[PDB]
Design a binder for these strands. Sequence first.
RNA 1: GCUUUACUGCAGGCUGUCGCUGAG
RNA 2: GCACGGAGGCGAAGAACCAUGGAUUUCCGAAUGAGAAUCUCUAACAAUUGCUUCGCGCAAUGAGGAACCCCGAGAACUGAAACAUCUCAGUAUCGGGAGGAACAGAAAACGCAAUGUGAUGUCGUUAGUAACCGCGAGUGAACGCGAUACAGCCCAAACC
Lengths: 65, 81, 119, 194, 46, 56
Amino acid sequence: TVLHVQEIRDMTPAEREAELDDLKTELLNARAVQAAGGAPENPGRIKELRKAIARIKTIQGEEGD
Amino acid sequence: SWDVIKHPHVTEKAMNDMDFQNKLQFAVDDRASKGEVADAVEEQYDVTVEQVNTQNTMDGEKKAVVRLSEDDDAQEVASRI
Amino acid sequence: PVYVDFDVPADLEDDALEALEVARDTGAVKKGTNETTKSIERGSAELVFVAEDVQPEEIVMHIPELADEKGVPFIFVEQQDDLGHAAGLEVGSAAAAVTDAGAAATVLEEIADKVEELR
Amino acid sequence: ARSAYSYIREAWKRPKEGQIAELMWHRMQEWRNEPAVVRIERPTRLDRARSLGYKAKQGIIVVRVAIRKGSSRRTRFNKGRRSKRMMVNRITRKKNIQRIAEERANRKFPNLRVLNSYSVGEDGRHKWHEVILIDPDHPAIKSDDQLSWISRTRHRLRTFRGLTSAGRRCRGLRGQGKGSEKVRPSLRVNGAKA
Amino acid sequence: GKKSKATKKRLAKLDNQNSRVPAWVMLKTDERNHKRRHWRRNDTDE
Amino acid sequence: TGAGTPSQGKKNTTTHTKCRRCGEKSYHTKKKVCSSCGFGKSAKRRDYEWQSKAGE
RNA sequence: GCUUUACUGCAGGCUGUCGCUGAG
RNA sequence: GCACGGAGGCGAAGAACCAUGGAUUUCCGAAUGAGAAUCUCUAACAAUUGCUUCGCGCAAUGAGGAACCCCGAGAACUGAAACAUCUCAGUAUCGGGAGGAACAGAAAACGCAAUGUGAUGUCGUUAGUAACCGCGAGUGAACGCGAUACAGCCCAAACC
Ligand SMILES: [Cl-]
Ligand SMILES: [Cl-]
Ligand SMILES: [K+]
Ligand SMILES: [Mg+2]
Ligand SMILES: [Mg+2]
Ligand SMILES: [Mg+2]
Ligand SMILES: [Mg+2]
Ligand SMILES: [Mg+2]
Ligand SMILES: [Mg+2]
Ligand SMILES: [Mg+2]
Ligand SMILES: [Mg+2]
Ligand SMILES: [Mg+2]
Ligand code: NA
Ligand code: NA
Ligand code: NA
Ligand code: NA
Ligand code: NA
Ligand code: NA
Ligand code: NA
Ligand code: NA
Ligand code: NA
Ligand code: NA
Ligand code: NA
Ligand code: NA
């Protein structure tokens, strides 16, 4: 959602990796908040974070990095 | 590719170790060695890992008790997540 | 071995091979057991060479007696690849037949004599 | 005129006569010391091989195989049997020794396929046959208009399905007329009666 | 007895399959765990 | 000693276990052979025609 | 299931012969 | 998703959903570096082969599949109102292997004997005929004919 395919392709191989490690971190922190029974959740995102990560990895493959 | 750290293992006991022994507890991938746990943890929170104790849990996952150096403060590293 | 009834001295073999080489250049030679066999049969053969390191021996066993009942002379060579090289081949050869020598009909004719004498 | 080959053939008509008789007496000694399946660089009976399909070409292999002589090596019954089936000594296998030899060779060369085979004699207890096998994957063979047919997928493991030379004869498929009622098109299709 | 890492993973799973169908699933399906296994009355594999 | 109930007491030996190949608790850990799929004995999978009625 | 000088066969043992197998 | 809750989210940046193609595709598994009840130990076509730059460099095999198919191994209950040959039956079952179909196949054929037919399967028939058989019980074709579909070729050798 907040991150579309065009925008991912408009990134440089280095921006995808930077964007990748960024999403992974948001995710890890979402899971930490979740692990702590934290309610300030928004389920639609922890799910989107996974998909966003998949898209970036998909593109990195298509582009050759 | 699998990641080393899965998420913070936050429970009463985990707190006592954090407040009283400067240790952080994590749920890690069971293919990960103490060494890999030590490194990963440092690179993710910018701290100095002094010791790591592991345990293969009856939940099917691995649990690591990571002790930080007197220079780092568990209570604080954990409070930002 | 089973088809070999006499031993040819190293030196004699050399003269023979030498003759064979000049035979391919000056005269005519047949390379290969099949082609050699037909010479002996057609009588166009003057001197036939037979290797002694042939396996299976079947491929050459007939040469001797066939040659005998056809008057054609024959000499033995130890190495199969030497006869092939001497015949001008990049590969070896189990048997060769000098079909009408060349600038060697002399040396040749004499090699036949030396052998007949070698019994 | 007679081909040189014709002489190898002539010799093998009577393997216990003349020169070949002495060669055999010689060879077997070394054979008896060899293994069950031995790849050999050249066919002992060149005329035969070539006649069967052999060519001095890449991907063409020849191998001598030893098989024991005699009837079936059979175990006596361990339960009830009517007299007719209590037999042991006189029972013989329905597959001839040359076919067994072809199968043993083929198993030694999993990638190759049997093309044909012929006999090279026997002593008091062995029987030797030379099997010609082919590499269906080697170009040179794939490109040979006389052997490429064996490259087809339909020919995978010919010997094991009796599509071989001796295979078809052993199956009673020689005759096209009288006698082949229970034979052609296949034994099994005929309820196994030939 | 001494269990291996794999054995432990399996016992872990079996214990997990041993939970009850969550309350919300009842409401979501407008209305039983047939794989309920007691440690005493039942026997696991291996 | 009765061959029944009293002889059932010594049964604390482990033999058949979850097989690595087929998943059945049929891997005989003493023999290292699966009685269900043939693992340890055969590369091919264990199967017989008598596992079903002759014409089926 | 068992027995035996029941009927009929089948392993096994002994023995002649042929092949392996040749010289005087 | 089945799955009708709660919360939250995605979709006109055209989502859901469908078709095709692509990406990802943990461990065990023919399982192949070695070992192991799905894990572990210190670069791997293990093993067997073909080719070979003789180096795993280039390749092959392995295992699966509802049955069908081909090649081997091969019972007994039963029937004969007992039973031995016979029968059940080349069945059940076992070993090996192929394909999308297998197998067979262009006559050392047939032999309505002919001045005739003309590769091979299969279907119908020939026929429960010929033939077998304690000539008991039982067993049991083929040529031909009518159809289906049709297709005929390559080596070895001679001579080079
Ligand atoms: Cl084959
Ligand atoms: Cl007719
Ligand atoms: K019977
Ligand atoms: Mg420990
Ligand atoms: Mg058929
Ligand atoms: Mg619990
Ligand atoms: Mg008892
Ligand atoms: Mg392994
Ligand atoms: Mg009866
Ligand atoms: Mg009667
Ligand atoms: Mg019958
Ligand atoms: Mg007829
Ligand atoms: Na967890
Ligand atoms: Na093979
Ligand atoms: Na028959
Ligand atoms: Na229990
Ligand atoms: Na009884
Ligand atoms: Na997939
Ligand atoms: Na391979
Ligand atoms: Na190699
Ligand atoms: Na009766
Ligand atoms: Na009775
Ligand atoms: Na009878
Ligand atoms: Na007619």
